[PDB]
Amino acid sequence: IIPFTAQAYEELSRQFDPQPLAMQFISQYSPEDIVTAQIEGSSGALWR
């Protein structure tokens, strides 16, 4: 999990800047707020 930095936050906000409310969500949430969901995908845990 990566706590998004100020620069990272700017990136996300700019990605969704065209949509006002999309950018709003990101921008309103404080920097080091938006966290990165780097969920693991590899397995080994068998299907049961």
Binding site: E40, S42, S43, G44, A45
Partner: protein, 141 residues
């Protein structure tokens, strides 16, 4: 774990220069009938696994194929824990002065007895009956 994860986990212990997060979470779920807001008192006692250390080289061979490697985890089994009704399994300091080096010498043994039948016994550096029943203590509040 699997080729995209266990073979990678293998590799880490084999070579991969990384520090496996050995979070020894000591969750202590109590009750709420006698009180205990966040009864579950938990603390992830992490042991960053130094790339290919003695412990990780034992784990290299453990995950290679053999099942006879006593992985030395430097004193990391809290034998005295001042846990309260909050969510923290903080061990008593002074009870275990180093409290990371004064916990209790813990060992690990993967028992892959192909018949890989990968089991996992938590031994002790001085396992008498603590390979099946590790006797620590929780100073409860």
């Amino acid at each position: 774990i699997s080729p995209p994860s266990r073979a990678q986990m293998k590799r880490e212990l084999y070579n991969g220069t990384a520090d496996i997060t050995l979070r020894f979470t000591w969750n202590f779920q109590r009750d709420l009938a006698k009180g205990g807001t966040v009864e579950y008192a938990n603390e992830k006692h992490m042991l960053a696994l130094a790339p290919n250390s003695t412990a990780r080289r034992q784990l290299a061979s453990l995950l290679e194929g053999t099942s006879d490697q006593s992985v030395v985890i430097p004193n990391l089994f809290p034998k005295y824990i001042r846990a309260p009704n909050g969510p923290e399994a903080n061990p008593v300091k002074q009870l275990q002065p180093n409290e990371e080096a004064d916990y209790l010498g813990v060992r690990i043994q993967l028992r892959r007895e192909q018949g890989f039948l990968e089991w996992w016994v938590i031994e002790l550096q001085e396992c008498r009956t603590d390979c099946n029943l590790l006797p620590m203590v929780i100073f409860s509040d």
